[PDB]
Amino acid sequence: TVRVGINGFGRIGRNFYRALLAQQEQGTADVEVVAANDITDNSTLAHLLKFDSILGRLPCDVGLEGDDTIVVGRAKIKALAVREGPAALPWGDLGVDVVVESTGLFTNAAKAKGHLDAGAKKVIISAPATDEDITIVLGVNDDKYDGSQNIISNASCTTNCLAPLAKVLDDEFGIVKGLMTTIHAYTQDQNLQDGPHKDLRRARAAALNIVPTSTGAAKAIGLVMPQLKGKLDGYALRVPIPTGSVTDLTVDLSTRASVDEINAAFKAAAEGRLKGILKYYDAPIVSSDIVTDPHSSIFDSGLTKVIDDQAKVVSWYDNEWGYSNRLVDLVTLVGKSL
Amino acid sequence: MTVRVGINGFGRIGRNFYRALLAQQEQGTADVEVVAANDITDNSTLAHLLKFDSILGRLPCDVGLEGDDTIVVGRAKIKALAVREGPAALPWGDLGVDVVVESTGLFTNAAKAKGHLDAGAKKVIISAPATDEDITIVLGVNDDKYDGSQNIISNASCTTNCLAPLAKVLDDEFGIVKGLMTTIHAYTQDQNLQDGPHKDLRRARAAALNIVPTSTGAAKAIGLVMPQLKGKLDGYALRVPIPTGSVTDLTVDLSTRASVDEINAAFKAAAEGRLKGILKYYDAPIVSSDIVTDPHSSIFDSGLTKVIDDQAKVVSWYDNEWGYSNRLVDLVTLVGKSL
Amino acid sequence: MTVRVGINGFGRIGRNFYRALLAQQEQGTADVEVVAANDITDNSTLAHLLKFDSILGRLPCDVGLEGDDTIVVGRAKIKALAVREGPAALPWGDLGVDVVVESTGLFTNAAKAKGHLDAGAKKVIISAPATDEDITIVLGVNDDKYDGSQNIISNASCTTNCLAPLAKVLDDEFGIVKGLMTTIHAYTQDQNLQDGPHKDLRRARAAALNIVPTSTGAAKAIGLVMPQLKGKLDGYALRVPIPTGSVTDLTVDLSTRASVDEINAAFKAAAEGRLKGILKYYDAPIVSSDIVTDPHSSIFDSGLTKVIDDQAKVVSWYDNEWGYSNRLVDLVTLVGKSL
Amino acid sequence: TVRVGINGFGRIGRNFYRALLAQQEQGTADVEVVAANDITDNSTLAHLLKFDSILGRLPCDVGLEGDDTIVVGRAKIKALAVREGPAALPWGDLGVDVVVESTGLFTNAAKAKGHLDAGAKKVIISAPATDEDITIVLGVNDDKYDGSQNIISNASCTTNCLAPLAKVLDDEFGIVKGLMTTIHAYTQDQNLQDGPHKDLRRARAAALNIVPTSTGAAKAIGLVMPQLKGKLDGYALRVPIPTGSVTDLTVDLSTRASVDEINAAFKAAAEGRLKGILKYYDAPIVSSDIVTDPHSSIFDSGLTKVIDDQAKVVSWYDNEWGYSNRLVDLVTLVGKSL
């Protein structure tokens, strides 16, 4: 059993824990979480884990003690008082193998190495990192991971959806250039009301309007697909929706492909080399049908449009549940190396 | 010389047209006057929905009622609303109505919309993409193509009044080879509040609980107002939990490789020149809340512009309710200037 | 040995009733089976609305179609939906339907609901307050008052199924002199997405853009299930931008002076004893998002309980879609046991 | 012109400034804002003031410089760098007479006295205070303010609505006791997603559910109406709405009155002693008709019900715009004593 410790038991931290529990019920997971770190007490963390506004209530019973939270008889050391850097957490004492860094403040590998120095064997950053050992999207460049990587980045949720769509289009037809627009759900980093913020777009009320923000999912596509480095760029549009997002990639193809050709190539890729990561839809679905869906990219074949050499591909993705299931699959791949 | 206007369908677009007409009269840039309104409800409900609005708030004028006419302020509008049959049953000729604004949504076909003309109307303006209409007009694009020989007039969609100025500037300055569109739109009344039956299984879902991808012909029928771009554009729509206010995201391949500053300066010159009042230039990090109750038909956001070689992505905001209705008022004044 | 059920109105309550039946069948506490569903749409839209739900997510079972029948998983439900007329036109006897769950909302009057009985149904359950019905039953309150001689059975409001357990515990333990309630309800399909015509000018406004205060007969008609409280209770409703999930706030004057701890202890004993399955006791800081997809009729929130002398305010949550539909499942199983 | 300095240019602060500008356009205002403090640069404050998600765009042009933000012909020194206590802000150097405390962290008069030490003549806290000189609700106990008060508070947004309703009910029929439930708009103190918070109820997603929270609006009614001290109590329920709230007071009356009697007493009070504070409405209005309404209490006569002596009175109020107009009117009343 791979011992995992979460740093930042927020939305992604609790989604990773719930996806790990669901994947253990499905049998495709072996790691267990033994520690969680956050800037709050165990009572608040246990209440936020039991009652979720988006994922509902947890089927297991959740209890507390004095420093640990008890779920299904299992116990997780709520080592949350560590308000300093990641090197202050006692991962070595708890025997934690893989650490899921999900605070949002330690995206730099120079800082993210504090987990490794504290006793951890490997670190998985749940966001685009800097100076990281490798940026992995499960199903795209997961084969490029040997045993010589410790600061591993699962990239962004948008990157985990754009990479499969761009991989199929480039490997089957070739990508000359593309511009994407991900229509994203609002996240905790936005303001509920009009208040100060480093981003004047996300400074506005998140639930009252649509805030166009930036993203590095397309500009950093070379981190997982080096042949597409500098060929993609785009931004994001935060809509009043809790979870569930969609990517709208408009790309010029090297070879002219029809709508039927692109849809047939995505259907064969979803049921083959990308089975479990990419899913093919021929049904008129909405984002409510994407909430709690573990797939990284949900290709919507109905919204495909092609003129001459320019093609628009639309693919859904759950920014919380789908990305956390990839963090579970990545923690299992790294745990297989430990 | 006041043009007499009659509204068929006093819904969201109908009341926004009356409010934009009243606001343009207070500004002095309007001469038409609405004299009649028809719906499928009594005059008390129409007067209440006009006074109290969830998006535009309360009306600054007092609103009263009688038995067959609704009185705003020093103004009387014959609430000829009992006419629930075809458009020919309405007494447009008896009431002396010059221009009829069709805003019900069920009379988009010019074959049925011709009943207004048979009923005594001089010109008919459909507030939606029509079929077999005399002309499809987008103010600021092909408004000059309207002479005196048109009676069944149409004003295209809310999305079209935003895409057309953006594609016109890009083609006149850099040339458009082909482009694809995704308009992020506010939800409209034709959507269901909860999951219920609907001809569109996408719009059948809860409008405020998710994003419904639906189809649109704004880009596919761009040749109706820009024949040089006919068949060069296509796209769809994505309804989001917002009452009013939408945005268009056009990714287009250009004939000539242009820079970000070139595209922004070209749109800025158009907004300050030939498209003053139709296109607006924004160099500030704005959001859709700033677009609510904005009379412009296309609000170009220069900060969201991106380009790769010749492929450019242009983002432009527009209020699908207020901005479109102000264009309907300007179109009614243009039609009144002919007859 | 399986009681055959047919749903008239496969809307929100209709699909929630079918999903609650399937979940109760997987738990083993249900024997009735739904064999027919009538709606104003084809079987394709019915299967799509059943498979994909905006609140309840996707169905774990696979859903297929044919030409007139929608196949769940192994089971087939005749989508007898062409019956767009009154409830007497549906062929319940030809389909062999024993109990009919009326959930269209347009056939709440017993003069219409009797059409199911004339069509071959043995018993009818209206998922709403009815007029001139045989009996109005709230499970856990007056469920004993049902003998074999009732056919026009009506389950009360979702608000009544939450207010009745509160008023029952308060009256049986402390006595109720008078009370005034205010239920904070989620928006429902009968409201408008934008400002449009409606019989209720309050519910005529945009449901998700504001809070619409509407009236309700939940508290005024409590005497139908507790005669000792007839006329002693009254209240209204306040629709808030929420898909599913509501809460009741009952301010009641008690006959005997009781403390906050005494009221919470009596409700905790009732939830753990006489009202196990209908009333739930919560000592955790819960919100309405913790109430969605909860089968309990009333979820008493002990933290929000307050009293001043003999005036007490009791707060209890309830899921107006899922929790109410489970009570329709239990009522259909009880009536099916009477056959 | 009364010199005013804002400490906390957030939602309430910018609502106070916009209400001051609108009241100056109406002609019934003389105060002028000269400073603003907000733990963010002048550029973010100028952008948040020009563009509002609820109040729309500002009709005046808004520009910036290096430390001051320009309205139109008016320049306001954005003294926002004062990140320490209120005693460190230079109110005396700028010549500010009255200071509007709107941060929410200096409600206690022990810390709020820093404004007076910094050179301010009077202090107006935009929230319930502790150890304050006097708690004033305009239209109720505003006459109890002489020149011998320096640290004044305007109570809560809910109190400014319950006080007129409780005053009319007590002066006409008498109040034995009452329990209220204010259905409130969500505010900045709530979380957008499920995250840690001092209040586990307000820790949940504010826009995805209703958060029941406590309030001292009814419990502290004795600060402005001593005869009702301890006779009123209630809580709050935050609903997914940006601005605009409503109070639902169920109160036992000393004399059994009818629905027509209570509605007639409220109509005469709104047309008499409470003209400008209480609004009477006979139309089926909703909260969208209450947004941006300067009244302190909008009595809805249609939602009134009675049985014996227990009556339920419903009154709307805009927690943002209406409360800020009461702050503007209070600043004009306090400035009249200088």
Ligand SMILES: NC(=O)c1ccc[n+]([C@@H]2O[C@H](COP(=O)([O-])OP(=O)(O)OC[C@H]3O[C@@H](n4cnc5c(N)ncnc54)[C@H](O)[C@@H]3O)[C@@H](O)[C@H]2O)c1
């Ligand atoms: N859908 C998504 O939200 C999503 C998707 C992909 C990636 N990510 C990335 O994952 C990370 C987490 O996202 P989220 O939405 O769950 O964020 P969140 O704000 O909901 O949770 C972040 C957590 O960090 C905690 N934290 C803050 N300071 C800390 C400290 N000093 N030590 C420990 N914990 C601390 C917070 O208290 C909170 O629990 C971010 O980097 C985000 O960009 C998020």
Ligand SMILES: NC(=O)c1ccc[n+]([C@@H]2O[C@H](COP(=O)([O-])OP(=O)(O)OC[C@H]3O[C@@H](n4cnc5c(N)ncnc54)[C@H](O)[C@@H]3O)[C@@H](O)[C@H]2O)c1
């Ligand atoms: N809503 C927008 O932003 C927008 C933008 C562009 C175009 N449009 C189009 O404009 C049209 C109207 O839009 P809306 O939002 O005002 O629609 P709506 O459904 O909100 O209002 C339509 C009105 O027509 C009335 N009506 C129904 N049947 C009628 C009949 N037989 N005779 C007369 N009146 C009748 C209805 O009662 C209602 O008042 C539609 O075609 C719509 O697609 C809407």
Ligand SMILES: NC(=O)c1ccc[n+]([C@@H]2O[C@H](COP(=O)([O-])OP(=O)(O)OC[C@H]3O[C@@H](n4cnc5c(N)ncnc54)[C@H](O)[C@@H]3O)[C@@H](O)[C@H]2O)c1
């Ligand atoms: N929504 C709730 O939470 C809730 C709770 C308790 C009771 N109810 C009651 O349920 C009924 C409405 O259910 P709902 O609001 O959940 O969903 P809904 O409005 O979708 O239910 C009605 C359904 O009946 C269908 N239908 C079938 N035959 C029909 C016919 N001949 N004419 C018209 N429609 C027909 C409609 O198409 C629709 O799908 C009302 O009686 C309401 O008071 C609803």
Ligand SMILES: NC(=O)c1ccc[n+]([C@@H]2O[C@H](COP(=O)([O-])OP(=O)(O)OC[C@H]3O[C@@H](n4cnc5c(N)ncnc54)[C@H](O)[C@@H]3O)[C@@H](O)[C@H]2O)c1
């Ligand atoms: N929100 C309402 O509707 C409402 C109504 C009545 C009273 N109030 C009360 O008014 C106060 C402010 O409410 P709000 O909604 O404007 O709050 P907010 O959090 O939205 O805004 C407060 C502002 O204070 C600024 N600020 C200045 N100095 C600060 C410092 N040292 N530390 C942190 N922030 C600092 C913040 O940057 C922010 O802009 C609170 O006491 C609140 O309870 C609010």
